[PDB]
Ligand binder design. Structure first.
Ligand SMILES: [Zn+2]
Ligand SMILES: [Zn+2]
Length: 139
RNA sequence: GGGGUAGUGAUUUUACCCUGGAGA
């Protein structure tokens, strides 16, 4: 008997918006840091966010995944702490998100979820703030 | 410029639409 459902964290490795899928690079599996990082499939239907769903390369994610015949596959994908994903830089309203949950219809003062860790304004990482964002720097 | 929409489940960055004497 061995695990069928696992928690993972990492970043979006790439995503094709038109096709609606891509891969995550998993940097931690069940709380264990991995080297090298491993690819986990992600389909648009599993993205936790409001409206047309996407990811951008480099955004911070957590997810639940399983092993399917084709390979590791995400079952649901969120930002850190279970908040909404960011999406493509072309996403309508995507530049005006609640600081706390990433939602599109309110601001942090009105947020109905409890205070979350501070996420980078550009990539949602909880390990840096935007003044030190390497994703923003190589963009 | 400004606004909006969506969809191919396996390997790399998306296809469209609306908008002209006025834009919260
Ligand atoms: Zn919120
Ligand atoms: Zn960042």
């Amino acid at each position: 008997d061995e695990p069928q459902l696992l928690h993972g964290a990492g970043i979006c490795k790439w995503f094709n918006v038109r096709m609606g899928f891509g891969f995550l690079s998993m940097t931690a599996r069940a709380g264990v840091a991995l080297d090298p990082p491993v690819d986990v499939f992600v389909h648009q239907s599993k993205l936790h966010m409001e409206g047309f769903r996407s990811l951008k390369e480099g955004e911070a994610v957590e997810f639940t995944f399983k092993k399917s015949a084709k390979g590791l596959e995400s079952i649901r994908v969120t930002g850190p702490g279970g908040v909404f994903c960011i999406g493509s830089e072309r996403r309508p309203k995507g530049g005006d998100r609640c600081y706390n949950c990433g939602g599109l219809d309110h601001h942090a003062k009105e947020c109905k979820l409890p205070p979350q860790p501070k996420k980078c304004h550009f990539c949602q990482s909880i390990s840096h703030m935007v003044a030190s964002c390497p994703l923003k720097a190589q963009q």
